[PDB]
Amino acid sequence: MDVVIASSGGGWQEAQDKALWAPAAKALNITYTQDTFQNWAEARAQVESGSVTWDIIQIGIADEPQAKAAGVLEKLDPDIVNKADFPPGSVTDSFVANSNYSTLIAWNKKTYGDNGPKSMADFFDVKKFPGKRALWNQPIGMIEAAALALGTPRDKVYEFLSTEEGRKAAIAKLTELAPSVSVWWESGAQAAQLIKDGEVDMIITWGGRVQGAINDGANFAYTFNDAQLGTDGYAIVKGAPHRDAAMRFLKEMSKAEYQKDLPNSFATAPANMKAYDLAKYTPEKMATMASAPENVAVQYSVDPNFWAKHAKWASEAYDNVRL
Ligand SMILES: NC(=O)CC[C@H](NC[C@H](O)[C@@H](O)[C@H](O)[C@H](O)CO)C(=O)O
Ligand SMILES: [Ca+2]
Ligand SMILES: [Ca+2]
Ligand SMILES: [Ca+2]
Ligand SMILES: [Ca+2]
Structure with a gap:
């Protein structure tokens, strides 16, 4: 009823x-x-x-x-x-x-203080920012993050990902980051828990979840720079x-x-x-x-037209990066 x-x-x-x-x-x-x-x-x-x-x-x-x-x-x-x-x-x-909402970069203040990653290039930079990364177990915002980390301008994300060349390079970039990914978070509340416990050094997750963890006492900071709207x-x-x-x-x-x-x-x-x-x-x-x-001003909007065409490729390709 x-x-x-x-x-x-x-x-x-x-x-x-x-x-x-x-x-x-x-x-x-x-x-x-x-x-x-x-x-x-x-x-x-x-x-x-x-x-x-x-x-x-x-x-x-x-x-x-x-x-x-x-x-x-x-x-x-x-x-x-x-x-x-x-x-x-x-x-x-x-x-x-x-x-x-925003799929954005958050970092642990105990690990980096105010000198945390402020861009996707910084997030993917294990050399300048050593530490445990956390990414979603689903591809939306994740493939685009890699494209941004490769130096693609925010307004060209889906132009770069329209090619099979760019789609492959994005997966290769995620593959290169993969050994530094300590947890492939599944839910917003799990992402918030990782933040509250300082179990990760940096994470790509949803703004509301991040702000909620910070409200709950998490020693983390975040930025809208390179975030997916x-x-x-x-x-x-x-x-x-x-x-x-x-x-x-x-x-x-x-x-x-x-x-x-x-x-x-x-x-x-x-x-x-x-x-x-x-x-x-x-x-x-x-x-x-x-x-x-x-x-x-510092974000890019998600493009449903890309996902309407490439989701199945993305779901399988991203699964392999995690496996
Ligand atoms: N709109 C918001 O403020 C919430 C933002 C964010 N939602 C992202 C997703 O849409 C998430 O809810 C799920 O994957 C979806 O509902 C399941 O398909 C979150 O849960 O944190
Ligand atoms: Ca939550
Ligand atoms: Ca804390
Ligand atoms: Ca902040
Ligand atoms: Ca949108």
Whole structure:
């Protein structure tokens, strides 16, 4: 009977539940159940198994093309949101954005002090910055990081990765870093734990997770330099048992009145542009936001068009680097 909503756990899930899910469900007088997952392939596994239990799944803008093509996503209702309220391309026929985030470089202050890695070239520099690296066990932001470490300008990341030559060089660069990678982190909360325990010297992970660990007492610092500007959002699983109830829930939770509370404790940036006027965030709060003008200036946006074409190559090639 409950609409089942799934995200990636930890601080990020707690922020969505507190700001969006609990108030939207209360306003619609509906009951919902939470679940946790780390990859859209788990939703693909449900659809292919012939037994769908999830209604709404929280995925990334670059997972959307792959998931839609594999028949994992329901087509959303046309005016579920007003597209003018969200950044361009962040709302498709099968995806509604809820936030922007950064896949960025964090470093251990006990290891490097203020003299930590401030670029991808620095992150990949085991000679100037010796120590334990941690990278995601999934490729989005990881392949691009290698491309940046090779000296590719931020605005040319996907131009360099369009060639089979650049795609191979990126994997070779990750292969060269691989002996220095002590942990291939799987979840945002695990990444936050590695940071809190100082188990790693540097890490490429999500800004909200990093800020959360620092808030919790981690002696780490970070930068938006060379970070990938990502977009998180929601999709309804093809064959969702509570499809029309999930459509109603998704429409409600996308509203500015809920979106405004999304960064209250967790360092994320709401996607509904109308939320900023309602919350009137302080410049200090804005500085932690991935989509803040000064932060965007040193980042590059993830390109779903690249992932729509090269994900399978990336998934297999990156698995080998880790193995
Ligand atoms: N939008 C945010 O602020 C959260 C950012 C970041 N989300 C990245 C991912 O989208 C992650 O949740 C998962 O891999 C995804 O939901 C599972 O497919 C995080 O969990 O830390
Ligand atoms: Ca966390
Ligand atoms: Ca510490
Ligand atoms: Ca910092
Ligand atoms: Ca983006």
